[PDB]
Nucleic acid binder design. Structure first.
Ligand SMILES: [Mg+2]
Ligand SMILES: [Mg+2]
Ligand SMILES: [Mg+2]
Length: 660
DNA sequence: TGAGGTAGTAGGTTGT
RNA sequence: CCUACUACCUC
């Protein structure tokens, strides 16, 4: 199993803190008028920033790595109107212990402030936050592309600086939203006001006069009175958007699509060079790239009717559990009837599978109106389970409407763009897999022994002020989804998690004849304090064992091999109850960083299962998703519900995956 | 709307 | 940490 290797990650070990840095200067803060119980953290922190030097926040005070005699121990900070005045008092020096978690926390704070305060005063270039840009990758007429490392410098257990490096580019332009438009470039989709820092969604140009424009004063007079039209020359009008709003000599463009990924090996090179450079110029010593041992993991045994290397091959071999089913066709283009090949391809797959299938054809059209909805009612009534939609590229709005309409009839839909050709294999072969998943068929499954019988993933909606908390089970070592719950933010209500979970327990109970022994709980991103409290409590009582795991996409940094190829499916244990995974294999892989939040399973065992769940995804076809099937499924569910409403999911079978 | 990835651009979860 | 969108590559 454990085909052990050794690969170092994009971190670096540097000189151990000196005695002085272990004894930071302590200061006291006297801000009058006294802040509100609620207005402290953001204020008390902007006071340190104001105080100058490498100083951070120290609980109810400040802590510095700079002699008080070079700080601004008096001044006045302003936050949200009120102008409170501050006053620092030098109050000794307390020794800090890196061995302690709580103490080390502030030292690492100072260390980041150090890195920022010392990088800013280099003859180099910009320093946008944690970022740094040495050279220039390109300098076209109107745009400039500078390249950089994004950095972080913290303190370890032993008390030595740790410097994490990761190369990154930046697209910055000089020309105005007018000189750039006159230079001969199409209208951007994003603009940022040059008096402020707020941005807009540039909709069009205004066929109106600046001076004679009626504002809610005079348009050209507004920006004039505010002294914004000095040293410049406002051009023509422009309808920005949040309902339009007048605004082009004052606006600036946000370049993105207009006007290259770093090669895998050519990235680790620039990573070390930037390190040698940041330690040499900052007097932090010779960077010792931190290496770690990895483990090649067991290959997944994905199996249709017969074992298979990828879900797409399940089309010529057969499905894992194909039941009798009938699909439908909806052409929003000209012609009628299934294309010859899409039919041959389906009958073969269902031939192999052994189940019988009947292709239908909807002789209706959306434009008919309600006549159209009954065309569906009749289709469903005749036994149709899912419908393939051949239509030229639709608009987002028209797309959701049609999707939502069919769902209101209990018919998931897989869209496929009419400009189609037989030799576009991957295209329509995936279209079929996606249709079939939506129909309720289990394309492939996993052969093997896994610690948990049930695997559920939780995520959170998007868009509008509110989100949708949602989860989706995976019965036995078939997949299904549950009815989501609209919530205020990203934290999922404690009893909402439980109820969502309970549904998957009971789903499993329906499939097997018994409650699960053990469940694998996968939360997308960080797991807000105690959002799984009520959940894990219950599982305990009900005598079913568990494992919670933060699956984080960002923050896994990089991981390069000491020498040779980078193997697919590396298990890279890090600290305690936390490890990496490079679950996939053009650019440079971004490893997932998992964190065992509760349970007693060996990390090696979790990593194994998690990695295997990767290949369980139905509409994947010729490539597997980066995270586990359940977590990836919860993502899309949550996404589509938030996209086109929860109101439609009412009459939709939970075993049908409409969101894929 | 074939799907997966990584790579940009914004804006901003939770709990400092 | 996450929520989106856009562009390139790949089967
Ligand atoms: Mg999330
Ligand atoms: Mg997500
Ligand atoms: Mg799909």
């Amino acid at each position: 199993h454990l085909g052990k290797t050794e690969v170092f990650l994009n971190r670096f070990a540097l000189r151990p803190l000196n005695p002085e840095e272990l004894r930071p200067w302590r200061l006291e803060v006297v801000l009058d008028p006294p802040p509100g119980r609620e207005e402290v953290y953001p204020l008390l922190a902007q006071v340190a920033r104001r105080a100058g030097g490498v100083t951070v926040r120290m609980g109810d005070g400040l802590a510095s790595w700079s002699p008080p005699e070079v700080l601004v121990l008096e001044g006045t900070l302003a936050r949200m109107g009120q102008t409170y005045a501050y006053r620092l008092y030098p109050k000794g020096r307390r020794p800090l212990d890196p061995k302690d978690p709580g103490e080390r926390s502030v030292l690492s704070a100072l260390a980041r402030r150090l890195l920022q305060e010392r990088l800013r005063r280099l003859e180099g270039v910009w320093v946008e936050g944690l970022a740094v840009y040495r050279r220039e990758h390109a300098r076209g007429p109107g745009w400039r592309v500078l390249g950089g490392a994004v950095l972080d410098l913290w303190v370890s257990d032993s008390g030595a600086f740790l410097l994490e490096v990761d190369p990154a580019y930046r697209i910055l332009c000089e020309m105005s939203l007018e000189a750039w438009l006159a230079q001969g470039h199409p209208l951007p989709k994003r603009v940022r006001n040059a008096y402020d820092r707020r941005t807009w969604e540039l909709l069009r140009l205004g066929e109106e006069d600046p001076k004679e424009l009626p504002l809610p004063l005079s348009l050209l007079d507004y920006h004039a009175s505010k002294g914004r039209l000095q040293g410049r020359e406002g051009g023509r009008v422009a309808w920005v958007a949040d309902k339009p709003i007048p605004h082009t000599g004052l606006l600036v463009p946000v370049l993105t699509l207009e006007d290259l990924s770093l090669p895998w090996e050519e990235r680790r090179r620039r990573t070390r060079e930037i390190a040698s450079w940041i330690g040499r110029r900052l007097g932090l010593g010779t960077p010792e790239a931190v290496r770690a041992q990895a483990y090649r993991l067991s290959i997944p045994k994905l199996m249709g009717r017969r074992a298979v290397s990828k879900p797409a091959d399940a089309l010529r071999v057969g499905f894992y559990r194909a039941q009798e089913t009938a699909l439908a066709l909806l052409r929003l283009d000209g012609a009628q009837g299934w294309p010859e090949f899409l039919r041959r391809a389906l009958l073969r797959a269902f031939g192999a599978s052994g189940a019988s299938l009947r292709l239908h054809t909807l002789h209706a059209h959306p434009s008919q109106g309600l006549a159209f909805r009954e065309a569906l009612r009749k289709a469903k009534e005749e036994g149709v389970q899912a419908v393939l939609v051949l239509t030229p590229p639709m608009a987002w709005e028209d797309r959701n409407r049609l999707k939502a309409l069919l769902l209101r009839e209990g018919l998931p839909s897989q869209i496929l763009n009419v400009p189609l050709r037989e030799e576009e294999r991957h295209r329509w072969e995936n279209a079929l897999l996606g249709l079939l998943a939506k129909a309720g068929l289990q394309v492939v499954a996993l052969s093997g022994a896994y610690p948990a019988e049930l695997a559920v993933g939780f995520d959170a909606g998007g868009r509008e002020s509110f989100r949708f908390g949602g989860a989706a089970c995976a019965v036995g070592g078939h997949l299904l989804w549950t009815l989501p719950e609209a919530q205020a933010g990203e934290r999922i209500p404690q009893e909402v998690v439980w109820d969502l979970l309970e549904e998957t327990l009971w789903a499993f109970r329906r499939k097997a004849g018994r409650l699960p022994s053990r469940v694998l709980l996968l939360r997308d991103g960080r797991v807000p304090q105690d959002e799984f409290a009520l959940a894990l409590e219950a599982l305990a009582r009900e005598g079913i064992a568990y494992d919670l795991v933060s699956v984080r996409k960002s923050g896994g940094g990089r991981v390069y091999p000491v020498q040779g190829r980078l193997a697919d499916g590396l298990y890279v244990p890090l600290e305690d109850k936390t490890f990496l995974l490079l679950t996939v294999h053009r650019g440079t892989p971004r490893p997932l960083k998992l964190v065992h939040e509760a349970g007693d399973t060996p990390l090696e065992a979790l990593a194994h299962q998690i990695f295997h769940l990767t290949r369980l995804y139905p509409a994947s076809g010729f490539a597997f998703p980066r995270l586990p099937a359940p977590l990836h499924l919860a993502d899309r569910l949550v996404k589509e519900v938030g996209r086109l409403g929860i109101r439609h999911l009412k009459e939709v079978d939970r075993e049908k995956l409409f969101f894929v």
